[PDB]
C-alpha cells in the first residue's frame, strides 16, 4: 500500500575530491516478486545526474519530465543546466504536485562546469531539499545506507577510493534489504570524465 515500498530500490550519492559518485541497485519488483533486474534509477541530462527511487511508474514519469524540461531549458538558454539549478527545478517540479505527489525520492549529483565544486542533493516526495556535502541516500534501505555511510564515509576521497566506499555502502546496505539488490550500478563523475561500473552481488 505505501507507494514508496512497492517496487523497491535504493540510490546513494557521495562527493570526494573534485568528483562525485552516485549509485543505485537494479531490482524492479512487485512486492515480493522480483520482476526485472535491469531497472537503472540513475539518469543524466548532460553532466547532471538524477537518481530516483520510489514507485517505478513515477520514477519513469519524472525522468521523462526532466528530460523534456532540461531540453527546452537548453534551447532557450543555449547552455546545459547546472546541478544547483536542476535541483531547484526538481524541487519546484515536485511541490507543484504538493497535494497528490509523485511517490519518489530524488537525488541529484553533478559538478558545476564553471566552478568545479562537486554537488549532490536530495529531496522527499514534495520538494523538501536536503543539501549536505557528505552523502545523500534514498530508497527502501535508507536506514541501512545511513548506517553504512556514516561509518564508511570520510571527506575528500579520490575517485578511485570514493568508488569503493560508495559501492560497499550500497552493497552491504542492499544486502539487508529485501526489496533491493539483484545488481548494482555506480557512476564516478569527474569534471572531464564519467565512468560507469556494474557490481557483482548476491542475486537473491
Partner 1 sequence: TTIVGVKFNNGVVIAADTRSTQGPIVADKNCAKLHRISPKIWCAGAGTAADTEAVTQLIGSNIELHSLYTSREPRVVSALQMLKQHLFKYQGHIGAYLIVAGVDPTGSHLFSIHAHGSTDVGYYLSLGSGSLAAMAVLESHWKQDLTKEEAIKLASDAIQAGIWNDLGSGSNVDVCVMEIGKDAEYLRNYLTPNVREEKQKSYKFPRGTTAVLKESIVNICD
Partner 2 sequence: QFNPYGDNGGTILGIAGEDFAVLAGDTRNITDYSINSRYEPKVFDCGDNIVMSANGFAADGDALVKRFKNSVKWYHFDHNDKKLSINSAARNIQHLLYGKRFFPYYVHTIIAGLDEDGKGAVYSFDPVGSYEREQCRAGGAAASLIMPFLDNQVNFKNQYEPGTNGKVKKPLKYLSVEEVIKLVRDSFTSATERHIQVGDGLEILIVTKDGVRKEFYELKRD
Partner 3 sequence: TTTLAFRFQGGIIVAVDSRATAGNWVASQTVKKVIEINPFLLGTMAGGAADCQFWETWLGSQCRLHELREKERISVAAASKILSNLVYQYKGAGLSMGTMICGYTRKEGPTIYYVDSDGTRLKGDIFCVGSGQTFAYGVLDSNYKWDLSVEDALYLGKRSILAAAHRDAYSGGSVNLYHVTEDGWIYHGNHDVGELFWKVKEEEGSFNNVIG
Q: Which of 177, 185, 188, 189 binds partner 3 (CB under 8 A)?
A: 177
Phi-psi region of 109 (alpha: psi -120 to 50; beta: other; left: phi over 0): beta
- Cα(152)–Cα(130) distance, integer angstroms: 20
Least distance from partner 3 to the Cβ atom of residue 149, Å: 17
Kindly indicate which of the ranges 39-47, 83-91, 94-102, 170-178 contains the residues binding Mg ion, using the contact rule CB under 5 A.
170-178
Phi-psi region of 85 (alpha: psi -120 to 50; beta: other; left: phi over 0): alpha
Kindly tell me the sign of the dihedral angle through the C-alpha atoms of 91, 92, 98, 101.
negative
Q: Which of 18, 84, 124, 175 binds partner 1 (CB under 8 A)?
A: 124
Of 125-154, binders to partner 3 (CB under 8 A) are 140-141
Three-state DSSP at 34 gives strand
Q: Which of 64, 143, 158, 160 binds partner 2 (CB under 8 A)?
A: 143
The residues near 199 (Cβ < 8 Å, ≥ 6 apart) are 167, 170, 171, 183, 184, 185, 186
Q: Which of 5, 36, 60, 168 binds partner 2 (CB under 8 A)?
A: 168
Give the nearer residue to partner 1 in terms of CB position, either 64 or 161: 161
Q: Which of 177, 183, 185, 187 binds Mg ion (CB under 5 A)?
A: 177
Could you list the residues that contact partner 2 (CB under 8 A)? 143-144, 146-148, 150-152, 168, 171-173, 175-176, 200-201
Amino acid at each position: 500500500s505505501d507507494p514508496s515500498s512497492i517496487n523497491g530500490g535504493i540510490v546513494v550519492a557521495m562527493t570526494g575530491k573534485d568528483c562525485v559518485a552516485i549509485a543505485c541497485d537494479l531490482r524492479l519488483g512487485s512486492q515480493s516478486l522480483g520482476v526485472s533486474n535491469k531497472f537503472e534509477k540513475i539518469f543524466h541530462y548532460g553532466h547532471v545526474f538524477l537518481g530516483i527511487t520510489g514507485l517505478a511508474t513515477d520514477v519513469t514519469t519524472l525522468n521523462e519530465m526532466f528530460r523534456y524540461k532540461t531540453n527546452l531549458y537548453k534551447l532557450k538558454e543555449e547552455r546545459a543546466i547546472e546541478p544547483e539549478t536542476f535541483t531547484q527545478l526538481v524541487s519546484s517540479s515536485l511541490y507543484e504536485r504538493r497535494f497528490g505527489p509523485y511517490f519518489v525520492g530524488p537525488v541529484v549529483a553533478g559538478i558545476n562546469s564553471k566552478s568545479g565544486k562537486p554537488f549532490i542533493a536530495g529531496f522527499d516526495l514534495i520538494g523538501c531539499i536536503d543539501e549536505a556535502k557528505d552523502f545523500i541516500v534514498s530508497g527502501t534501505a535508507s536506514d541501512q545506507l545511513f548506517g553504512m555511510c556514516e561509518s564508511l564515509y570520510e571527506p575528500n576521497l579520490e575517485p578511485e577510493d570514493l568508488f569503493e566506499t560508495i559501492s560497499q555502502a550500497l552493497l552491504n546496505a542492499a544486502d539487508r534489504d529485501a526489496l533491493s539488490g539483484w545488481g548494482a550500478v555506480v557512476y564516478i563523475i569527474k569534471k572531464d570524465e564519467v565512468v560507469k561500473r556494474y557490481l557483482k552481488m548476491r542475486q537473491d
